Design a protein around this motif. Structure first.
Motif, short mmCIF file in Angstrom:
data_model
loop_
_atom_site.label_atom_id
_atom_site.label_comp_id
_atom_site.label_asym_id
_atom_site.label_seq_id
_atom_site.Cartn_x
_atom_site.Cartn_y
_atom_site.Cartn_z
N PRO A 123 38.27 16.60 93.10
CA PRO A 123 37.39 16.03 92.07
C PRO A 123 37.52 16.71 90.71
N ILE A 135 40.57 15.34 89.07
CA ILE A 135 40.34 13.96 88.68
C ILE A 135 39.53 13.95 87.36
N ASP A 136 38.54 14.83 87.29
CA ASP A 136 37.74 15.02 86.08
C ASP A 136 38.56 15.35 84.87
N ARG A 195 45.43 3.51 85.56
CA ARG A 195 44.01 3.45 85.75
C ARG A 195 43.53 2.01 85.92
N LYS A 212 34.88 9.41 94.22
CA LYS A 212 35.82 10.25 93.43
C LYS A 212 36.52 11.28 94.29
N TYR A 213 37.57 10.81 94.97
CA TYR A 213 38.33 11.61 95.92
C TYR A 213 39.57 10.78 96.27
N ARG A 261 38.25 1.30 89.20
CA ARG A 261 37.58 2.37 89.92
C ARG A 261 38.49 3.31 90.65
N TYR A 287 37.81 7.27 91.04
CA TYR A 287 37.35 8.05 89.91
C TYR A 287 35.93 7.83 89.43
N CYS A 288 35.18 7.02 90.16
CA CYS A 288 33.84 6.64 89.76
C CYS A 288 32.92 7.18 90.85
N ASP A 289 32.36 6.29 91.67
CA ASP A 289 31.36 6.64 92.64
C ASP A 289 31.96 7.08 93.98
#
Length: 142
Positions: free
Chosen positions: A47, A50-51, A107, A31-32, A110, A27-29
């Protein structure tokens, strides 16, 4: 951490008993989807999806639902950014008349853990599993 590693990890959930699918999703760098169980909807998470899961607006999804791998879902409760908890409870929508399934999200630092219950599996136990998995993954650097 390794990607065959991540596949083995998510595949554990198919031996668990609780669950019909699972996924680890960055979910960070990155994100997939990192790994997902074969033949489910989580393998298709985008993505954009996820957003919505991680987004700053944490109320609009109570009116509008959200999708996961394009499957329509409802949000039952959200504690994803409550530091002692870091979970959300979701339910798939049907159909008309097919079964619905509960979904728990946890969560980590990352990544996100998604699990989907089998038919009739309650949300509480799924929630605990996602919570535990998230914690374990945090402990591991993710």
């Amino acid at each position: 951490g390794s990607m065959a590693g991540w596949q083995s990890y998510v595949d554990n959930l198919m031996c668990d008993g609780c669950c019909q699918e699972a996924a680890i999703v960055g979910y960070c760098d990155a994100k997939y989807v990192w790994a997902a169980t074969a033949g489910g909807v989580f393998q298709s998470i985008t993505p954009a999806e996820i957003d919505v899961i991680i987004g700053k607006d944490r109320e609009g999804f109570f009116t509008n639902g959200l999708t996961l791998g394009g499957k329509k879902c409802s949000v039952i409760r959200d504690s994803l950014y409550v530091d002692s908890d870091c979970t959300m409870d979701i339910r798939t929508k049907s159909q008309g008349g097919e079964p619905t399934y509960n979904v728990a999200v946890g969560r980590a630092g990352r990544v996100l853990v998604f699990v989907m219950g089998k038919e009739g599996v309650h949300g509480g136990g799924l929630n605990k599993k996602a919570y535990s998995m998230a914690k374990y993954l945090r402990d591991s650097g993710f």
